[PDB]
Symmetry: C3
Subunit: 387 residues, 3 copies
């Protein structure tokens, strides 16, 4: 700072701190990484084991979640909505994107054996974050004996739940419970973490085997659904987006999402986000990508493989070529309506330039300019063979 975005290297990142819990593990990326600090965001991935519950929490930041693996239940709770009688539970499965306003509590539960992987971007720079430039979870139940290790200056003390901060008597008089039941909720010394294992069953919602001024608004949608893809060249792959126009609640989150499933040796044409920072998380497979900054320098050139995260701040241009049989990723963008501009193909900035600018710009023939401008016939996905 105040040059946070003068980036000379990008590296494909993995988590920095790992909260080990009883039934899975929260894994958090270091938002102090220059590249994340440039993005404005942190990243975290829940890994949830069988019979595991991610206990209710809420954040100071808009959140956008993508369930990368397995399936389960997610539970939302807001102010004023119509709340055994609880607010609505939901079946979540792989490909589902999930939007949360700041201050909204959410829990997740895994029923199966396949681990439930949920992957999330916390938007730190948004005005909606009226605190701080760290990810700040507020736990309603779990105790976190490791403490806030993702936030420096913590000095190695535990992070108890919200209820622990109150005296047990004021709790008692508030909930109308016994002072000893009050203390129970404080989960003092509780070793489990925030992903706890459920004893007995979880008759939360019955899966029927039968089959703003928007509190009714829907906050889930599936991205793996090619019916709704922005592009579908079945031989190459599909890319799918999530706009304000698909979930109105996003206009306010200022957040967006893209899903991509491509096949070995398919190339995503070189592009840049006109109005958003990206953060790209690989779901399945590996691709070879190059990234170019404002100085025309190559800030990244390498494989990006599953579980990894690459930051693509506004204006940086990327080019991706699948290496593995198939490659499936998800990009999170800091704009409720992210715009892409391609540098190649039939909708490229170059394509919209007059030939004569192209020849004089590159000091090349008029015919060569004609080639570079018209040859690549595809819009966003093309073939390619090599390394």
């Amino acid at each position: 700072f105040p040059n946070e975005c003068q980036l000379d290297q990008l590296n494909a990142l993995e988590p920095s701190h790992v909260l080990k819990a009883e039934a899975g593990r929260i894994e958090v990326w270091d938002h102090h990484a220059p590249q994340l600090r440039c993005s404005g965001v942190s990243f975290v991935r829940y890994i949830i084991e069988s019979k595991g519950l991610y206990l209710p929490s809420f954040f100071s930041t808009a959140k956008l979640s993508f369930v990368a693996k397995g399936e389960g239940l997610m539970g939302r709770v807001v102010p004023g909505c119509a709340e055994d009688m609880h607010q609505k539970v939901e079946h979540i499965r792989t490909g589902d994107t999930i939007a949360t306003h700041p201050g909204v509590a959410q829990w997740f539960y895994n029923d199966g054996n396949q681990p439930l992987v949920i992957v999330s971007v916390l938007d730190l720079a948004s005005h909606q974050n009226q605190l701080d430039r760290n990810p700040r979870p507020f736990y309603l139940a779990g105790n976190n004996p490791q403490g806030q290790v993702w936030i420096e200056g913590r000095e190695q003390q535990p992070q108890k739940n919200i209820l622990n901060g109150f005296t047990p008597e004021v709790l008692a008089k508030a909930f109308k419970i016994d002072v000893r039941t009050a203390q129970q909720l404080q989960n003092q010394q509780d070793n489990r973490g925030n992903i706890i294992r459920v004893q007995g069953p979880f008759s939360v919602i019955r899966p029927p085997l039968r089959s703003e001024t928007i509190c009714s608004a829907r906050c889930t949608d599936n991205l793996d659904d090619p019916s709704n893809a922005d592009v579908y060249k079945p031989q190459l792959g599909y890319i799918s987006t999530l706009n304000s126009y698909d979930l109105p609640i996003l206009r306010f989150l200022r957040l967006s999402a893209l899903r991509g499933s491509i096949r070995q040796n398919a190339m995503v044409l070189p592009q840049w986000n006109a109005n958003a920072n990206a953060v790209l998380y690989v779901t399945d497979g590996e691709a070879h990508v190059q990234v170019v900054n404002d100085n025309g320098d190559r800030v990244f050139d390498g494989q990006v493989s599953q579980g990894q995260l690459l930051s693509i701040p506004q204006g940086f241009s990327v080019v991706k070529r699948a290496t593995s049989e198939q490659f499936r990723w998800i990009e999170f963008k800091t704009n409720a309506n992210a715009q892409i501009n391609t540098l190649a193909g039939r909708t490229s900035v170059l394509r919209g330039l007059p030939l004569e600018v192209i020849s004089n710009g590159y000091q090349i023939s008029l015919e060569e300019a004609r080639r570079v401008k018209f040859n690549t016939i595809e819009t966003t996905l093309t073939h390619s063979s090599g390394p």
Copy 2:
């Protein structure tokens, strides 16, 4: 302790003003916005004391302003950019009385006059961190007439210079050429070494009342009416609120307010704002309050009394409890429609939790889980006592 970890607060205190500007007919008492706790919120706070017949001379600010008449009565006038000009004719001049909450856009001149016999106390927040403030993380009052000898003692770079009105700024000649007046008269507009300050005694007659696209819609509203409040249990007290729905102009100011009046032992159930930083000011009486971290630490716990400010960042939880005969406060929130979330009661976040989440979460019985979820039937206010 400071940016960009501005909000890793580990203690709060009841805050009093740190600087008193002394004027002829009253004072202007201003809180320290360098205080970690107030910097975290992005607001400053200032209190006027206008003695009888005193006039707060016209200032405008760089920042949204949300004022509250804590006690007294008097007149007050705005001067919006060239509106309805209704032998003297001048813009609207309204009366104001305790309870009144006044909105001011950046750039709008405001003045106050105590036409009554008891002291006029206006108490008001400045939204520093808002994007409407295109200056500085600083209260920056621009004075139309008031000369102030103590100078900007609330900004760090001052160096003890005196702070003169705007007119003082131009050469008296140009001031003459512009208002089309005698240079003599011009110089007199500059109030050099007028020591009165900004709150002056008026002389003789004060017979004023005589003759985005909103020079019309309302900018004032009274919160001391228990019949237009949100919850009014006469047993306990009332809490009334000023939303953008109430005063549609707040949509722009990004500021809401909340007014509380509760009697002894009345308790305001543990709550947090999902989407607003708050500044609580005690107008009458004394309450005992607790506040909780995202670490689940008690960062406050103690008495907060008349004339004090307690800063409550977004996501911190707060239980209030009247200690005096009657306790009356005013909450200022950085959101044109703040959203409270309750940790206990019929609106609680725990209400909208499936019981098996509550039970497993805190490791308590199902009997215990059904109480913790249901016993408290009240929404916001409640008696300080349990089973």
Copy 3:
């Protein structure tokens, strides 16, 4: 001073460029945004000075851009993400013959005011006789800049061997176009062209800079016969579209968002004015915007007063100089040369000016007894201060 007291300013100065990028056929003169005075306003400023036959090559920015053409005439090309191809180009001698499809190439003349979304690429050409001078504000503070407190050109073609000299720790590394950053091979696979040709695209070592001499037939328009097709250009030298037009004194014209709806997204606003010697623009401030003032013609004497009541500028300001005026600072300006002409760029889609003197004065809206008890003057003297000036914004003096 410095953040978060970036606006404790005690002295402002008429400013000029602080670095120059000299190109084959023109130069980019860029202002210093690290100047305390410019840092407060949260913007940078730049002037393209384009020679004849001179092409300024396609660049896109990470922030909003509001351009003004101060001197000259020429062509401009915008290119948005995924739009149809408007214009068409005759092919001179046709074999295999094809013409050219491409975005709309507009003509620009002095007074045109252009708007650019972050991510939009633009190039300028001087078909004209004299030098073409475009002047531009870049909105650094705006939420739309996802990057940094610096202006960041992204160059599609031009090489800049001087590098990013306007940013701090660049250490004299050259600045290549975007294409240079990809291996020639991937570029070839992407453009389905020969790897030897992909090398050429990277303009490695090209020392022309970003404004080049166009050799030959720049025949770019042959015969002319939710908002993707909104209006983004407009001419402020057109007095039929002015807020105030006193033809003895001069005019002030304005680009609110009520004129260019796309501005409500850019969070930017403009104000062009022409006044004649000794005309005065009554003391005003901006209620909700930071201003940046550029003189395009002549001289005027201005005073700027801050919130401490001090005079932070009091002097001459002439052609090519820029004066920063933060929200709340109050400004008076008297024309001094035969006629004074200037362009203000405000940091609000719709800017509210508040006058201290005249028919809309802030004082005009005060009760007499506040004016009289305030400055301690005569009730008669108050009647005067409040009413004597009947003009709103413009007036004559000496």
